[PDB]
Amino acid sequence: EVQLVESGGGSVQPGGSLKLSCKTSGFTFSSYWMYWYRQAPGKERELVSGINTGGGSTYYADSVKGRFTISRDNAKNTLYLQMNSLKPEDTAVYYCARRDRGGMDYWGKGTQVTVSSAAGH
Ligand code: NA
């Protein structure tokens, strides 16, 4: 079965950094564009970033430009999101997704990121 599994979430200080991983199995990852989405409190789901097969970013949301970097490792079949200069409003469940025209969408279960002044340093 197709598997997408996010990890790397947790609590982090405002201004801090986190790197999320989306480890995949059960399909030819290197053939697909891949995406990060997020679901924040009281808001609609938001597309964060997309990446093409060869590992070039296709898109960043205005809200994350200059702070986040999408990347992939086709040898490990893993997608990443490096997040920097985190803000309270980046608190959300983050999801990786495989989506393509006339194909079936697949989503991970998501990972919680919490940007909090009470986070460990
Ligand atoms: Na896709």
Residue numbers in the entry: 1 to 121
Text of the article:
Single domain antibodies (sdAbs) can be generated from variable regions of heavy‐chain antibodies, which lack light chain and CH1 region. To obtain sdAbs against Nlgn2, we prepared the extracellular domain of Nlgn2 as a recombinant protein and immunized an alpaca with it. We employed site‐directed mutagenesis and introduced all four VHH‐like mutations (V37Y, G44E, L45R, W47L) into the hallmark residues in FR2 of both sdAb A and B (denoted as sdAb FR2 YERL mutants) and prepared the FR2 YERL mutants as recombinant proteins.
The sdAb A FR2 YERL mutant was eluted as a monodispersed peak in subsequent SEC, whereas the sdAb B FR2 YERL mutant showed a broad polydispersed peak. The L11 residue normally interacts with the CH1 domain on the IgG antibody; this domain lacks the camelid heavy chain antibody (Hamers‐Casterman et al., 1993) and the exposed L11 residue should be hydrophobic. We expressed and purified sdAb A YERLS by IMAC, conducted SEC, and confirmed that sdAb A YERLS was eluted in a monomeric state. To confirm that the mutations did not alter the overall structure of the sdABs, we conducted X‐ray crystallographic analysis for both sdAb A YERLS and sdAb B YERLA. When FR structures were superposed, the root‐mean‐squared deviation (C α‐RMSD) values between the crystal structure of mutants and predicted WT structures were 0.58 Å and 0.40 Å for sdAb A and B, respectively. Differential scanning calorimetry (DSC) analysis of the sdAbs revealed that the melting temperature (T m) of sdAb A YERLS was higher than that of sdAb B YERLA. SPR analysis confirmed that the mutants sdAb A YERLS and sdAb B YERLA maintained their binding activity, although the affinity for Nlgn2 was low for both engineered sdAbs.
